[PDB]
From a paper:
The highly up-regulated CJA_3010 encodes a signal peptidase II lipoprotein signal peptide (predicted by LipoP 1.0), followed by a serine-rich linker and a GH5_4 catalytic module, and was thus predicted to be anchored extracellularly in the outer membrane by N-terminal cysteine lipidation. Indeed CjGH5D, CjGH5E, and CjGH5F all displayed high specific activity toward XyG. The limit-digest products further revealed that all C. japonicus GH5_4 enzymes specifically catalyze hydrolysis at the anomeric position of the unbranched glucose residues of the (galacto)XyG polysaccharide chain. The overall structure of CjGH5D (residues Gly96 to Gln468) is an (β/α)8 barrel as is typical for GH5 family members.
A time- and concentration-dependent inactivation of the enzyme CjGH5D was observed upon incubation with XXXG-NHCOCH2Br, which followed pseudo-first-order kinetics. The dissociation constant Ki and the irreversible inactivation constant ki for XXXG-NHCOCH2Br towards CjGH5D were 1.78 ± 0.17 mM and 0.17 ± 0.01 min−1, respectively, resulting in a ki/Ki value (9.3 × 10−2 mM−1 min−1) that was comparable to that previously observed for a Prevotella bryantii GH5_4 member (PbGH5A). Notably, intact protein mass spectrometry of CjGH5D following incubation with the inhibitor indicated covalent labelling with 1:1 stoichiometry and no over-labelling of the enzyme. A second oligosaccharide complex was obtained at 2.1 Å resolution by soaking CjGH5D crystals with the N-bromoacetyl affinity label XXXG-NHCOCH2Br, in which the reagent had indeed reacted through attack of the catalytic general acid/base sidechain to displace the bromide nucleofuge. In molecule A of the asymmetric unit, there is electron density for GXXG-NHCOCH2-CjGH5D, whilst in molecule B, XXXG-NHCOCH2-CjGH5D is modeled, but with the − 3′- and − 4′-xylosyl sugars modelled at half occupancy. The carboxyl oxygen of the N-acetyl moiety forms a hydrogen bond with His323. There are hydrogen bonds between this subsite − 1 sugar and the catalytic nucleophile Glu390, and also to His208 and Asn254. The covalent adduct formation through the reactivity of the N-bromoacetyl reagent is fascinating given that in the structures observed here, the attack is made by the acid–base Glu255, as opposed to the enzymatic nucleophile of the enzymatic reaction, Glu390. However, Glu390 is too distant (6–7 Å) from the reactive carbon of the N-bromoacetyl moiety, and has impossible geometry and steric hindrance, to permit nucleophilic interception. The reactive group, however, is located in the + 1 subsite—some 3.8 Å from C1—thus can be fortuitously attacked by the acid/base which is in almost ideal position for SN2 attack on the reactive carbon to displace the bromide.
Author numbering: 96 to 465
Amino acid sequence: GLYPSYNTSPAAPDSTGMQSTAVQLAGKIRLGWNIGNTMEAIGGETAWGNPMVSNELLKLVKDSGFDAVRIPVAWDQYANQESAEISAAWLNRVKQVVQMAIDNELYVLINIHWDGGWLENNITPAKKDENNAKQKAFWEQIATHLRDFDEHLLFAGTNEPNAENAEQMDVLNSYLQTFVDAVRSTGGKNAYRVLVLQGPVTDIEKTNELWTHMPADTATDRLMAEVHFYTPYNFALMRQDESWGKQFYYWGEGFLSTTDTERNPTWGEEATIDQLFDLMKTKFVDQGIPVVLGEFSAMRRTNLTGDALTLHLAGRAYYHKYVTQQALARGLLPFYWDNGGNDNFSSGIFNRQQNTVFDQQVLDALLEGA
Ligand SMILES: *CC(=O)N[C@@H]1O[C@H](CO)[C@@H](O[C@@H]2O[C@H](CO[C@H]3OC[C@@H](O)[C@H](O)[C@H]3O)[C@@H](O[C@@H]3O[C@H](CO[C@H]4OC[C@@H](O)[C@H](O)[C@H]4O)[C@@H](O[C@@H]4O[C@H](CO)[C@@H](O)[C@H](O)[C@H]4O)[C@H](O)[C@H]3O)[C@H](O)[C@H]2O)[C@H](O)[C@H]1O
Ligand SMILES: [Cl-]
């Protein structure tokens, strides 16, 4: 009894609008966009440069060709730390954003993101019990408040849990079972809702190596797995050279440099992507289990000038088309990581301030890849 029970209005199981299995639900989704740096921002929905999610944004997203949004959400900072009660106002706000995305005929995946680290950086036997308790209390509140949405709303229990060995993986399995049991306990449409479970560090290789099983579920065929993809780091996100490796400015057959050769990839090209996706195809998809590719993007390097710029941008685009297409070919649901930035080292494909397209190049790539 570290915190009180938040499962206070359990409802009869309700199969209405909840007719699809994870596999069927997955058939409906081919392209996803993260509302990145927004509802998960530390300090508030607008503390990381993005405006509050508006219907206009969600209408643009649907209209641009996305079927789904992944909505990272911060929770801990809105919560009474003694009782783990989440502000009702935050809860209403997350509900309201869910309602609007569902008004726009988008599928929606809400998580508890990094959220300041309380779970994500503490996949550890010392923290296991208090974190299991907090997981339970928060998921009880989130699931109850969102209980009435149809199958357009999926839940994801964690973001990127830092488990790098089998001991930490056993703690993660517990954190995931707690999530599943929380949500199911609230009843209603939550008795059948599709839930998404995260691999260790959402890393394909560590998931293949460490993952053992899915949490136990009272529902039949309502679970998906999730990985992320930022491979190779040197291209997608590296902003400075280190002793151990240099930033890649270019990527893809066709788009490599002959002037500035050390800025080409030494790894993480087309074959590696295909290989990593095949691990996820054989461990999960062939076994009956869709895989959410919850985040991928290669950041823009607008600090390049002239011919270097022009070439980086061509490979960047292709990287995104290639990832999308190769994931879809193997039953991974690709969700683009959009942090809303339109500046250097950012990933925003929309201009959130004007509800317009900022990077038509990357959007067409994603679409043609879809
Ligand atoms: C493995 C995996 O899948 N990881 C995922 O990685 C992606 C890619 O990194 C993550 O998204 C990134 O999140 C960080 C926040 O990071 C926290 O949560 C993720 C944790 O893993 C990490 O340990 C945590 O620190 C985002 O960084 C934050 O960005 C905001 C906004 O401003 C920046 O980004 C937009 C650009 O346009 C802009 O140029 C750049 O500054 C920062 O907020 C600003 O901070 C300044 C500094 O004081 C302040 O002036 C200003 O008013 C604020 O707006 C914040 O400082 C910074 O932490 C990153 O953008 C995002 O891509 C994903 O969450 C993982 O799941
Ligand atoms: Cl349908």
